[PDB]
Amino acid sequence: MFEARLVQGSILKKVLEALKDLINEACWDISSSGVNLQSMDSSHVSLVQLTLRSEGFDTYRCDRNLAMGVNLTSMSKILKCAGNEDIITLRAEDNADTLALVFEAPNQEKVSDYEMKLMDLDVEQLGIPEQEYSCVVKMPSGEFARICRDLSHIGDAVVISCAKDGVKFSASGELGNGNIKLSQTSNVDKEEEAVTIEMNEPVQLTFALRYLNFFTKATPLSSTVTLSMSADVPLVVEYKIADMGHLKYYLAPKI
């Protein structure tokens, strides 16, 4: 049997809103460690890797390693019926074809019980080796989301170029070009809303902005986002899930 008690329900809500619009069908991996999800988009151009550790739940119990084939759209529907302060409880049986979601209001005398049908999945499991990247930019979530949205009005692709002074995002379309420049902020007092760069050698890669804007839906999860870049290797956009796991987006470059 699998039964997990998460009290910060908003988290899961947010998480699913970060996935429904990017990946349709998904394989949730439940194991003694926690939940791990890893899937590609329909075109095999990006990759989402979610990790939620059992150390983040109020009560986590796993018996057999379970592999749930879930439709993220249906799950997003079912989770929109949950409150941001609702305590969520997920459960499933070893030989089950359904996941049960129990939303408990803060002992409000209200209790929602949904039963989501599961499915059989013949997935493709990719191997992402741990790397050291040339450029690593830790910036505010809001500024990165801004830049992506903004440069989306100009063209569809963005040229991210990282160097020691700051990072610069460039776009070009039938109506012109855009160049946003973020400098390495030295906020002695404030930690968030800072742009810290860790460079090994300048990098300049071209990425699609549609998938970056898909990635930016996870902004409510973290106040900071970490971009990781190295020549000829995919881009890693990393959001931290409040000290219990991480959501990692990997995006293939252009040419």
Binding site: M40, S43, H44, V45, S46, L47, L126, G127, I128, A157, T206, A208, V233, P234, Y250, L251, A252, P253, K254, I255
Partner: peptide
């Protein structure tokens, strides 16, 4: 333009 996430992982 535009590489699949393949080419790098297997």
């Amino acid at each position: 333009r535009q590489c699949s996430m393949t080419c790098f992982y297997h």
